[PDB]
Amino acid sequence: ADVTITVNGKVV
Amino acid sequence: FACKTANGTAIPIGGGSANVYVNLAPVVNVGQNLVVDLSTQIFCHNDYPETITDYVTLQRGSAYGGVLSNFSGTVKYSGSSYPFPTTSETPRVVYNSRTDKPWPVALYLTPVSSAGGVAIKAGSLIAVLILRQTNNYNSDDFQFVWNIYANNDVVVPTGGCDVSARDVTVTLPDYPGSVPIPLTVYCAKSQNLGYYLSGTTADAGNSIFTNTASFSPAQGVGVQLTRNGTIIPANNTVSLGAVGTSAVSLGLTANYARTGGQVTAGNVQSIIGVTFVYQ
């Protein structure tokens, strides 16, 4: 791909 | 004829091929993209300018190397542009001074993709340039090779458009919070532009990206992108209308979405690709 989006998250 | 790079390192003239390390700042332009402007990287001077006048041309067979070997373009040499790989020798640059003057060379790339890019790592070859050196006083006529290496990690734009970032990292607030994704795009000239998302989906609808978090990961949740409140599924064209020299946000927002089952506490991660297309 042209861009790579790394999403980081958390479920508390 | 004697040359040095921007950092003052001397380029040994003649002998075998020379490994010349230089800095890149690749940008898209109208009808061609800049790979490297060597005029800020290589500077040259003459030590007997009163009696001797040095002539230097770019011999045919000067071409890209490494990952760029595949591409074609042009080379702007002394204000005029020529196809690259060079099919014939360029006209000469004159070196009549003891003052270091730059080497007026810029390597360009012909656009082939919409907004693609080629990763270029530090220490890797980018061009193989053949030079021919003569003078005004005797018959000395010698050719030598300048292997041009990159001194910094960059991504050469191979299209008409350029993305604000090639690797975006966003941090979602704790579940079930959302956050915009910082990402814009612009083109050298107006392009009817669109894009779509790709990656590993969790659902049949192809609208939720799988959670690939390794340490203490969450169950039952995935990542889902929206735009103006509208869910964007994978491999779905989002039209941006006409995109020009002004940066246009993709409008993407990151969210959480339940994948089914009990939602359990832990980390969440999703790598999502973005690919641009013409319309």
Residue numbers in the entry:
A (entry chain B): 1 to 12
B (entry chain A): 1 to 279
Quote the paper.
The adhesin FimH at the fimbrial tip specifically binds in a catch-bond mode to terminal α-D-linked mannoses of N-linked glycans of the receptor uroplakin 1a on urinary epithelial cells. FimH is a two-domain protein, composed of an N-terminal, mannoside-binding lectin domain (FimHL) and a C-terminal pilin domain (FimHP). FimHP possesses an incomplete immunoglobulin-like fold that is completed by insertion of an N-terminal donor strand of FimG, the subsequent subunit in pilus assembly. The two-domain architecture of FimH is a prerequisite for catch-bond formation because the interactions between FimHL and FimHP determine the conformational state and ligand-binding properties of FimHL.
To establish a stable, isolated FimH molecule with all properties of FimH in the tip fibrillum, we complemented FimHP with the donor-strand peptide of FimG (FimG residues 1−14; termed DsG). The experiments described in the following were performed with FimH from the faecal E. coli strain F18 (FimHF18), which is structurally identical to the most prevalent variants in uropathogenic infection, and FimH from the wild-type E. coli strain K12 (FimHK12), which differ in three amino acids in FimHL (K12→F18: Val27Ala, Asn70Ser, Ser78Asn). In the absence of ligands, FimH adopts the Afree state with associated FimHL and FimHP and an open conformation of the ligand-binding site, which is responsible for the 30-fold faster ligand-binding of full-length FimH as compared with the isolated FimHL domain. The results revealed equilibrium dissociation constants (Kd) of 3.6 and 9.9 μM for FimHK12·DsG and FimHF18·DsG, respectively. The rates of HM dissociation (koff) of 22 and 58 s−1 for FimHK12·DsG and FimHF18·DsG translate into dissociation half-lives of only 32 and 12 ms, respectively. Our biophysical data demonstrate that this mechanism is conserved between the K12 and the F18 E. coli strains.
